[PDB]
């Protein structure tokens, strides 16, 4: 679901669910011979901690000193188990745990 | 007595006369371990061992002067028992030596109880008022009543 979201934001060329249990393949996409994904980091460096995100804790991020700023992309796993980007996550105003960030 | 005078008819009419009924073990429950009942709504009735109240009279050494208080023993009574067993039955539940100092004949309202009879002939239930008189009821009026400290 994450690659599905990053794809729709264009950070990756295109994923594919080979339906292999172990691993699927995602095509990176480069611009200016520089990878599109500058800084991508998993939210919880440890699995034991699973940080959840209020619909306001995300909304504060979109505003970098007064300008609605959708540069960074955060992925959230909703309670309904919908892998959703933080942008849509505030749209329908629902929270979820935080998987990773990318920008 | 309104509750009791009421349930007097369930005695016969609820269980004795109906030639048809059933009694269902399971969902026929008992008391809890939170020291109380649990709010269900029914019971026809039954009490095999009727708890009998037996009230006594014994003196206690108050700081000022001797005085006698009402030590009542609540004994479980077999509804088919003779009173001679009752007087025998009660003596072990004294819990205080000062109660059963000697023989005593149980009494109702001053009219003594006939031991060879059962509780059915006397018709004794819980609310029946059974005093208990020691042999020395004649004593304790004579000047050897009890020795106090002056």
């Amino acid at each position: 679901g994450c690659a599905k979201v990053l794809l729709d934001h264009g950070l990756v060329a295109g994923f594919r669910d080979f339906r292999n249990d172990r691993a699927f393949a995602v095509e990176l996409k480069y611009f200016q011979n520089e990878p599109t994904i500058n800084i991508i980091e998993p939210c919880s460096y440890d699995g034991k901690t699973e940080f959840e995100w209020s619909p306001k804790m995300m909304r504060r991020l979109m505003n970098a000193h007064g300008i609605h700023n959708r540069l960074i992309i955060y992925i959230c796993r909703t309670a309904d188990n919908r892998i959703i980007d933080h942008i849509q996550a505030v749209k329908e105003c629902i929270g979820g745990r935080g998987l990773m960030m990318a920008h | 007595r309104r509750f009791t005078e009421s349930q007097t008819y369930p005695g016969p009419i609820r269980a004795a006369t109906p030639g048809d009924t059933r009694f269902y073990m399971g969902s026929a429950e008992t008391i809890l371990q939170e020291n109380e009942r649990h709010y269900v709504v029914d019971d026809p009735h039954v009490q095999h061992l009727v708890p009998l109240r037996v009230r006594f009279k014994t003196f206690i050494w108050v700081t000022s002067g001797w005085e006698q208080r009402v030590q009542v023993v609540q004994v479980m009574a077999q509804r088919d028992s003779t009173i001679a067993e009752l007087m025998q039955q009660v003596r072990i539940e004294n819990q205080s030596p000062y109660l059963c100092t000697s023989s005593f004949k149980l009494c109702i309202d001053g009219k003594d109880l006939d031991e060879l009879k059962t509780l059915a002939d006397y018709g004794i239930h819980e609310y029946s008022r059974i005093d208990a008189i020691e042999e020395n009821d004649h004593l304790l009026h004579t000047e050897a009543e009890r020795l106090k400290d002056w």
């Binding site: - | 073990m25 399971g26 026929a28 429950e29 008992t30 809890l32 371990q33 939170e34 649990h38 269900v40 003596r91 072990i92």
Partner: protein, 267 residues
């Protein structure tokens, strides 16, 4: 080794044959074969009629190299001896005993992950591993796998006993591998980690209680709050561990006290 454990090694020296359970199954299921097999007796038989007899190639252990005893008949006795269970290397003698025992407890004949099978497969290895280790006392390479095998032993046993204790008693009693099962210590037993292992395995609720202790008493009423016992008392059921004598004598006294009161206070 110990009296119980060495009892198996006796059956290893002269080996072990197929149990009749396999050879009788083959008959009551494939009548034309068993009629054909006992008809071709002694003759060099050019077709493997007994193929269904030995399904897995390792299910052949009576002779060497998993060469089925039936193939050898048409030859001279000199050959039938060279492959006898007598002339096996010890490394095979384990695989002869293993494939024999693991066959007995195999609920699924081809399976090698059934907790009964997986148990015996390591269980017998531990003995002959201990058999080796004590004889020549110092061999570090052997000692390490002894930790690896007991781990795969206990992980199998604590998982097995929940599946069926009946089979399970055979795995512990016959080989006396109980010593590795004995709880690691008091702390890991006091805090429950000895019991919580069944939880951390996932076989906590896997009993199918309909076999023993009909659940009509194991569940106190939620409406009422009655304890476990009261719902058995009201149903007339009894669920008591067979008492120790420690709890037996103290329970006799409790039952006699207020009767013993009728003894003492008649004086």
């Amino acid at each position: 080794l110990s009296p119980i454990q060495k009892k198996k090694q006796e059956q290893m020296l002269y080996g072990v044959n197929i149990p009749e359970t396999r050879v009788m199954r083959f008959e009551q299921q494939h009548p034309l074969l068993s009629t054909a097999l006992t008809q071709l007796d002694g003759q060099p038989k050019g077709f493997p009629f007994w193929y269904k007899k030995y399904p897995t190639r390792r299910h052949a252990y009576e002779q060497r190299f998993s060469v089925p005893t039936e193939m050898l008949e048409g030859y001279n006795d000199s050959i039938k001896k060279a492959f006898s269970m007598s002339m096996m290397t010890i490394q095979e003698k384990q695989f002869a005993q293993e494939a024999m025992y693991m066959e007995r407890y195999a609920e699924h004949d081809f399976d090698t992950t059934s907790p009964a099978v997986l148990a015996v497969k390591r269980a017998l290895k531990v003995r002959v591993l201990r058999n080796h280790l004590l004889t020549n006392p110092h061999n570090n390479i052997v000692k390490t796998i002894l930790a690896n095998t007991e781990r795969k032993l206990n992980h199998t046993l604590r998982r097995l006993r929940k599946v069926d204790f009946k089979r399970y008693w055979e795995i512990i009693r016959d080989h006396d591998v109980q010593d590795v099962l004995q709880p690691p210590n008091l702390v890991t037993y006091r805090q429950g980690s000895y019991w919580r292992y069944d939880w951390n395995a996932g076989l906590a609720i896997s009993t199918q209680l309909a076999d023993v202790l009909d659940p009509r008493g194991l569940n106190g009423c939620v409406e009422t709050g009655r304890s476990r016992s009261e719902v058995a008392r009201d149903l007339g059921l009894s669920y008591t561990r067979p008492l120790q004598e420690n709890e037996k004598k103290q329970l006799s006294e409790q039952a006699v006290y207020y009767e013993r009161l009728a003894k003492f206070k008649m004086e």
